[PDB]
Amino acid sequence: TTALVCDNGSGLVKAGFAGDDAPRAVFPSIVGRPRHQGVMVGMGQKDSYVGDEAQSKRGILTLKYPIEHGIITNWDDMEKIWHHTFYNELRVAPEEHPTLLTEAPLNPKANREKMTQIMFETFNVPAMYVAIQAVLSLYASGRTTGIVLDSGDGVTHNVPIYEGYALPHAIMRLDLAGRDLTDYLMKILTERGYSFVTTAEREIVRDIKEKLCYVALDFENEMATAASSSSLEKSYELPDGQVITIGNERFRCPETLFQPSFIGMESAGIHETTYNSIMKCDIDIRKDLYANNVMSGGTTMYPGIADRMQKEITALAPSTMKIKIIAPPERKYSVWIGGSILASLSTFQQMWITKQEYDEAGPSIVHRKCF
């Protein structure tokens, strides 16, 4: 029996079978409702479009994200995501395959209650399991200890896990991630005069952020160079045929990750969040966490982030211990990959939360079983 690994991400849902290297269905978590008037008769005009069907027809659809900051807001939209990724994407019955799911750290408990209730009652399963995304990222790295900076679309958290034990107090969570970077990029793109007000324009600027943006190694020198010469100015072609050009904004958008006061989110930087999460731990285990800095998530897929992150941590930490940033190229699906690593194992069969345990203990044995 092949299990199903499904990261229901804030930004992108990644799903597929057990033990695979790549996830089968990778699609953004949006729900598209029509906002203009349908005039043509027949021909299957749906009242809601889910996933890539909403992505293709995004010019006439109001787009809804069901998850904000790692918290499932719209439950019916999330049910549409779940039913689409079971029946249209993977085309598998839920009643004949167990399912692994992901959860953000410092989540509300009733989110886990409703997730367990929906995944046992709406789509009946033989078994399911809920795992922490940072644990699956560290398992995707293959190391038992280390600290994972997991950065999705709504939430960014530093979790140190020593020898398979996730430290609860040392988990640090900041709700600043790539959707906030997308909204800040939509704000600063009006400096050159490119107005973006719609939800489809958010997807266009998100594609611009995925393609063109990059982390600067030194923000002041890059700003002085972009002010001096127009070498960093890059042209992007829009789907209507218009061509825009952007300069310093290729690095000003991820600089909000290092300088969170750009959007007024008054908090420390993510390197400072990482260093304070390290200093929350014991001094005996700090040398292990300094050389095992794993960065997961697609938000960390800018091609300048590792050297700047090592520079900022090496500035923050003393020069005693070795600083090593773990940046795999397959990090964007790595949680799913770690779930696939947790899928095929022999000792996971006792750890499956069964239907009988759900009927015995409600949707509340996931709190005492999973961490």
């Binding site: 293959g142 398979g164 022999s346």
Partner: protein, 323 residues
Amino acid sequence: KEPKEITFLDAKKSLNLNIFLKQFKCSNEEVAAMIRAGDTTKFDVEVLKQLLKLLPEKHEIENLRAFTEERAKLASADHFYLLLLAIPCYQLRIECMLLCEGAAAVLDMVRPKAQLVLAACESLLTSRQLPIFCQLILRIGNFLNYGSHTGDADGFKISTLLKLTETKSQQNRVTLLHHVLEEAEKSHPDLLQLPRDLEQPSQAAGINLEIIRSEASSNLKKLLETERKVSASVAEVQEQYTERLQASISAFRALDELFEAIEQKQRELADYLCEDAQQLSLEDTFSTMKAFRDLFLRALKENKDRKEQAAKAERRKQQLAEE
């Protein structure tokens, strides 16, 4: 189905070994070959730490050697331990690879910092503009303390440079050091090239030298014990590891010669500052000179901002007078 894996381990250790084995993305025969060849490319400190933390136990080795049935019936964990038991002196080879990679890591860690500390001591014994600047601070302080017991002195300690920013003017914004640098920007600019001699004293040690020295001595002792165990071992392990052990002991002996040079320069710096050597005249002097150089550059930057703000205020006053 075949659930009878005949695994002599428990669930958790076999679980952690199945976590550990799957990151290599290859068969365990290649892992046993890389243990036997001593290849350290895929084997950093953490992988060998997890491998030594998942060592086979005495009853596990005894049950593997008492296993008389077909070896395909075993799990991948027990087959990996049978491949591990097939390697002669396997734990010795793992300890040689871990100690060689750790010795290379600690040598590349400590040795540029130790060269920085030795160059810091050599530039603190021999500094060009430091006696002229200390003579200027001495003359200004002898003018300031005229009529007190502290005044009419021929010198001061190195802790006086930390106490330069403690004394402030009537405005409580221009310090003693800020006023001396505003005077030295006009009269004697060569003292502004004082950090160019202090740039090897810049960033200090930043560390405890006793911690890295005890780690270097413990690593050298472990390398000597390991070279003695390899010298008791077979000649294949000897031709694999003895040249790397000899280079590691030679580099750590050069590091201990460097540490003795830092001790001799520490005694020379204690005699330079006219202080006894029983107190900490090494790390306190590095922290004192690092903080002195940081306050020196901050006084340069604040005097630069003060002169730029005065020039901008003069330009704004001239533009208001013209309008």
